[PDB]
């Protein structure tokens, strides 16, 4: 079995805990990052990790984080959680290289399947 870690970067405190705790209960290794900046600083140290973003403040959406990761010359399979009915965010996430986007609200089974799909991109 592959020992990978799901790295959750969520701006809204409560939502971050909700997703992380839910993944934790399903047996995933999970690490919560307090901010996009914190994750970027940690990114070069990531081995066998999948990234899940739920960034709402347009100051650094998941798309900008993906772009910044690209500049660091680091690739991490990423799922970008997008706003309910937000078409541009989803389109931009896929254009930026996300393995998939997930529009909110989502079922736990759906985000879990996306994360497993993204983990398949790890060597």
From Swiss-Prot:
Obligatory cofactor(s): Mg(2+)
Gene Ontology MF: a single term: transcription cis-regulatory region binding
Domain of life the protein comes from: Bacteria
Keywords for this protein: Activator, Cytoplasm, DNA-binding, Magnesium, Metal-binding, Nitrogen fixation, Phosphoprotein, Plasmid, Transcription, Transcription regulation, Two-component regulatory system
Modified residues (4-aspartylphosphate): 54
Statement: the UniProt record of this protein carries the keyword Disulfide bond: no
GO cellular component: cytoplasm; protein-DNA complex
Presence of the UniProt keyword Membrane in the record: no
Record-level GO BP terms: nitrogen fixation; phosphorelay signal transduction system; positive regulation of DNA-templated transcription
Post-translational modifications: Phosphorylated by FixL.
Positions that bind Mg(2+): 10-11, 54, 56
Localization terms from the record: Cytoplasm
Domain Response regulatory residue range list: 5-119
Designated name of the protein: Transcriptional regulatory protein FixJ
Organism per entry: Rhizobium meliloti (strain 1021) (Ensifer meliloti)
Encoding gene, per UniProt annotation: fixJ
Residues of the full protein shown: 1 to 123 of 204
């Amino acid at each position: 079995m592959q020992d990978y870690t799901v790295h959750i970067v969520d701006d809204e405190e409560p939502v971050r805990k909700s997703l992380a705790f839910m993944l934790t209960m399903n047996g995933f290794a999970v690490k919560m990052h307090q901010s996009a900046e914190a994750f970027l600083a940690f990114a070069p140290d990531v081995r066998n990790g999948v990234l899940v973003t739920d960034l709402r403040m347009p100051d650094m959406s998941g798309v900008e984080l993906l772009r910044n990761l690209g500049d660091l010359k680091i690739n991490i399979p990423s799922i970008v959680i997008t706003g309910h009915g937000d078409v541009p965010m989803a389109v931009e996430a896929m254009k930026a290289g996300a393995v998939d986007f997930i529009e909110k609200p989502f079922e736990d089974t759906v985000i879990i399947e996306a994360i497993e799909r993204a983990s398949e991109h790890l060597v």
